[PDB]
């Protein structure tokens, strides 16, 4: 402490409106305020919390699903059990990515391509292939959940139509994700400082559409089940409806979050409401798998 | 892009060794390198991941413990069930704290006390009372686990000695945590820019000691159980030993992590190895509670 300045005794002085002087690719003499630096830091601090929550939840839900399910040879169990493992691998590679030199303030303020080494683009390119494999696992899980609902001979002509509207949309989603990943990765590899390509996010709208379709099918199945269990002399649910609606056995909340996500503007948290919705869909698929496979009008 | 400088064509130029020019309390003209700024940012990015993992794990382990335990009126269940809730409340208040103005780069580089408002010290002071209540819950859980082991009349003179060495150490731990919190909070309230007081971390050594004592008691109980189940004509464990040793039914891994934590220097991750060890102890207490209460030599 050599000498304290006059600014230490000004009650109306506002730090954060001061100016940082720095050197960039456009020559020495660039300037920024402290609030833009803090806004750059707060987005990394905000997107590390979500992926830590994802890694923790999926890691502790894998063990629980092993120790609690009794029949462990069905395909639906295996697919639900590898989706959480791709969640954990995605979170691990994202943790590696966030502490490297490609998501730092140094690169952001000073856009020097000398700071990026070969390997950072490979950790940034493996993540976009883990994402496509996680989406493929979710879509195949949904298709397997649609197959088992209409196994009986009550409606053997609506089930094939629904399988044909839930199959095409899953290869549409996995194809728009592989084309977006290969088209972002050719650009990223060619030049390190380049704008990533987006297509009206025409991939999260397809994922949303698929999950909305699943919600629709399960609600329709419940409405049909009530009418089936009244014409025949059987009892009817009293407090079981609230479980099969609000307890994510119909994928209702993960299908409200995505349609509040792709409707609102980027200002109100568009990039935050999709990571939570993917986590919620992946965690809610073991619940929807128990209702879909269940018998419609059994004791 | 007005004009690109010569530094864009130097292969040997190293960004990060450049210098930031800023204004501080010691007058205008202070300087720092980009690597110290990135070192300040990386510690916040590293300590948000751990608390996100804590919030996720505890939040999804609370629901599972409710839906899976059959008897839900024992005291041990209630204490184990409120410890995870204090973990979630601690994580929530820490998430609020990390995005405020007290953990920012602006305050760090420019130590102006005008940037801190009344309320940030209250969010920084509630956290140190949630920590003391979490520690109190852990200690009372351990004392209740010690009480139930020696309920029988085989050894009615060793159990009271162990309860008297596990009770005094728990009020010692909760008292050193309340005195450290009140003594850090009087200083923090008096002046916002002040050094926090430490006492050779003489609180994490006590927590470690208590958990080590629990590990010791449970290993002793297993060794005694084998000798009890041999003299009498009863069967013996074949692959159950590895469960009761390596599967955290004896608190072994949470008691190795703390003694690798308070032994190593602060350079090798002392502040990282204690948050993981507290999470592991809190998650492993439902396992240790099933062995301790279990009958020693029953079928
Ligand atoms: C079902 C189980 C696994 C629990 C799931 C809980 C999540 C839905 C919660 C827990 C922690 C929450 C996060 C805690 C803190 C923040 C920071 C918050 O940031 C701000 O709004 C302030 C700073 C800024 O403006 O960026 C945005 C929401 C977010 C990511 C929250 C999003 C929702 C999360 C992930
Ligand atoms: C990639 C990440 C998730 C880390 C990898 C962790 C695995 C090495 C762990 C996590 C879940 C574990 C499984 C969780 C549950 C079981 C069932 C368990 O058997 C039983 O509990 C039933 C039969 C019996 O009672 O013995 C045998 C071990 C196993 C397969 C575990 C083997 C080791 C696994 C695969
Ligand atoms: C889901 C379960 C199975 C955990 C999976 C963890 C992996 C995603 C992690 C664990 C070890 C990691 C590796 C550990 C070390 C390195 C070297 C590292 O080398 C560097 O260039 C950076 C360090 C340096 O500059 O020397 C590049 C990433 C890599 C391959 C890491 C890639 C990500 C890995 C494979
Ligand atoms: C199911 C549960 C028990 C998790 C099982 C898997 C773990 C053993 C894996 C999953 C994620 C892994 C982590 C993912 C990322 C990192 C960051 C990595 O950091 C680096 O070395 C690069 C960044 C830098 O230091 O600059 C070190 C390994 C570590 C902690 C990995 C250690 C091993 C972890 C915890
Ligand atoms: C857990 C199961 C599903 C296997 C998945 C493991 C992957 C997460 C690992 C295995 C091979 C790894 C890759 C092996 C080699 C490299 C090159 C490596 O190049 C470097 O810059 C570091 C080494 C060097 O300096 O040459 C960067 C990481 C990368 C892409 C690794 C990224 C992480 C990968 C894909
Ligand atoms: C709305 C926000 C504030 C979250 C509230 C907490 C949820 C994460 C909890 C509260 C109710 C819970 C549900 C209540 C009951 C069940 C039935 C349970 O299945 C059974 O026990 C068998 C069927 C039966 O007992 O009827 C599976 C978990 C689930 C869906 C629970 C999942 C987790 C839920 C949604
Ligand atoms: C099944 C259980 C776990 C569901 C719990 C309810 C969630 C769906 C809610 C509870 C908290 C909510 C968050 C609370 C605060 C915010 C900040 C909010 O921020 C803004 O509006 C502007 C700031 C910005 O995002 O940049 C955006 C929505 C979000 C992430 C909310 C998203 C929806 C969340 C995660
Ligand atoms: C979006 C929110 C609701 C997610 C919250 C976390 C879920 C992924 C967890 C928390 C509660 C768990 C449930 C708690 C209790 C049960 C009952 C359990 O039933 C049995 O053990 C049946 C055994 C037999 O078949 O005889 C099967 C797992 C299940 C549905 C669990 C599945 C995983 C759940 C839904
Ligand atoms: C039992 C269930 C709930 C799984 C628990 C997993 C944790 C034990 C793992 C998951 C994520 C891990 C973290 C992922 C990344 C990092 C960064 C890693 O690298 C550095 O920070 C290096 C130094 C630096 O660059 O600052 C240090 C370990 C740490 C905090 C890991 C610590 C161990 C964590 C919390
Ligand atoms: C902020 C953090 C602490 C999360 C708080 C979420 C609560 C609103 C949730 C989490 C666990 C839930 C409980 C989990 C299990 C049950 C048992 C459940 O019992 C049943 O009738 C169904 C299962 C059975 O038959 O045993 C009734 C709801 C209840 C108390 C749930 C009520 C709502 C709770 C407390
Ligand atoms: C763990 C579960 C059971 C409960 C978690 C609840 C918390 C996440 C909430 C409850 C009360 C909330 C606080 C209520 C009021 C405020 C004051 C609010 O505004 C101010 O600080 C004053 C105005 C100003 O900023 O000038 C900032 C958020 C904060 C600390 C809130 C932060 C989030 C808190 C701690
Ligand atoms: C039902 C179970 C899964 C528990 C769910 C808990 C959530 C409802 C809580 C826990 C942590 C909370 C978060 C903790 C901290 C923050 C930062 C806080 O930041 C601010 O913007 C503060 C106000 C301001 O300064 O403007 C906004 C609310 C938020 C995201 C909270 C939103 C509500 C959350 C996600
Ligand atoms: C869920 C059950 C266990 C109850 C726990 C509720 C907490 C989440 C609440 C109760 C008291 C609250 C605190 C009461 C008072 C304050 C002071 C307040 O400071 C102000 O800026 C207020 C005005 C001033 O004093 O200048 C900031 C929020 C805080 C710490 C509150 C944070 C949220 C707390 C801890
Ligand atoms: C990161 C690497 C080192 C893998 C870590 C894997 C652990 C997180 C797993 C592997 C073995 C698991 C244990 C295997 C068996 C049991 C017994 C189980 O209790 C029973 O006796 C029930 C058995 C059943 O229901 O089939 C409780 C969970 C526990 C301790 C498991 C807890 C989680 C453990 C330690
Ligand atoms: C019982 C099951 C849940 C497995 C638990 C595994 C953990 C006990 C391991 C796995 C990953 C380990 C971490 C991997 C990497 C690091 C970075 C390492 O960093 C250094 O040595 C120097 C850099 C720094 O100061 O951070 C310190 C230990 C730590 C946190 C390790 C601590 C011990 C961890 C959390
Ligand atoms: C990294 C280590 C510390 C494990 C972290 C996760 C634990 C907190 C979870 C994972 C597996 C869970 C166990 C999985 C299965 C069981 C058997 C279950 O047995 C019953 O009484 C119900 C019937 C049955 O499922 O067999 C009781 C809960 C318990 C011990 C669970 C307690 C909580 C455990 C240990
Ligand atoms: C930062 O940039 C401006 C140029 O507009 C200059 O006036 C100022 O002297 C520089 N340095 C400081 C410490 O303010
Ligand atoms: C900084 O900028 C001025 C003009 O842009 C230039 O003359 C000078 O060489 C640069 N470097 C230093 C160290 O002043
Ligand atoms: C930053 O501080 C040093 C003082 O040692 C000065 O030489 C330099 O001109 C300042 N500004 C820049 C842009 O380098
Ligand atoms: C910056 O520092 C010098 C000497 O320390 C001082 O004369 C000057 O008033 C300060 N402010 C500006 C804007 O140059």
């Amino acid at each position: 402490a050599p000498s304290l300045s006059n600014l230490f005794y000004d009650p109306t002085y506002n730090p954060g409106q001061s100016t940082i002087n720095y050197t960039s690719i456009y020559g020495n003499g660039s300037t920024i305020t402290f609030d833009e630096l803090q806004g750059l830091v707060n987005s990394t601090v905000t997107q590390a919390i979500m992926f830590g929550v994802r890694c923790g939840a999926a890691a502790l839900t894998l063990i629980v699903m092993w120790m609690t399910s009794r029949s462990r040879k069905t395909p639906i169990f295996i697919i639900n059990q590898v989706s959480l493992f791709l969640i954990i691998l995605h979170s691990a590679l994202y943790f590696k990515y966030l502490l490297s030199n490609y998501s730092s303030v140094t690169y952001a303020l000073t856009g020097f391509p000398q700071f990026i080494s070969r390997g950072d683009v490979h950790v940034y390119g493996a993540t976009n292939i883990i994402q496509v494999l996680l989406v493929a696992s979710i879509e195949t899980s949904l298709v397997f959940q649609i197959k088992v609902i209409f196994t009986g001979d009550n409606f053997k002509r609506i089930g094939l139509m629904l399988t044909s509207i839930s199959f095409t949309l899953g290869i549409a989603t996995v194809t728009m994700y592989f084309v977006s990943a290969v088209k972002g990765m050719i650009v990223t590899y060619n030049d390190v400082s380049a704008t990533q390509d987006k297509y009206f996010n025409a991939s999260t709208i397809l994922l949303a559409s698929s999950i909305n379709f699943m919600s629709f099918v399960l609600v329709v199945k419940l409405i049909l089940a009530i009418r089936s269990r009244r014409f025949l002399g059987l009892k009817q649910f009293d407090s079981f409806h609230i479980l099969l609606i609000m307890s994510c056995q119909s994928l209702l909340v993960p299908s409200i979050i995505f349609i509040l996500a792709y409707s609102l503007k980027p200002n109100q948290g568009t990039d935050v409401l999709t990571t939570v919705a993917t986590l919620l869909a992946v965690l809610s698929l073991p619940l929807s798998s128990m209702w879909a496979t269940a018998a419609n009008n059994a004791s």
Side-chain angles (χ1 to χ4, degrees), chain A residues 85 89 93 118-119 122-123 126:
Chain A
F85 161 78
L89 177 64
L93 287 153
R118 285 285 165 271
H122 300 347
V123 177

Side-chain angles (χ1 to χ4, degrees), chain A residues 123-143:
Chain A
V123 177
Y124 186 64
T127 307
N128 293 343
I129 290 296
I130 303 307
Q131 179 81 253
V132 184
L133 292 172
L134 161 67
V135 174
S137 303
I138 292 154
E139 299 292 345
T140 195
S141 188
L142 298 163
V143 172

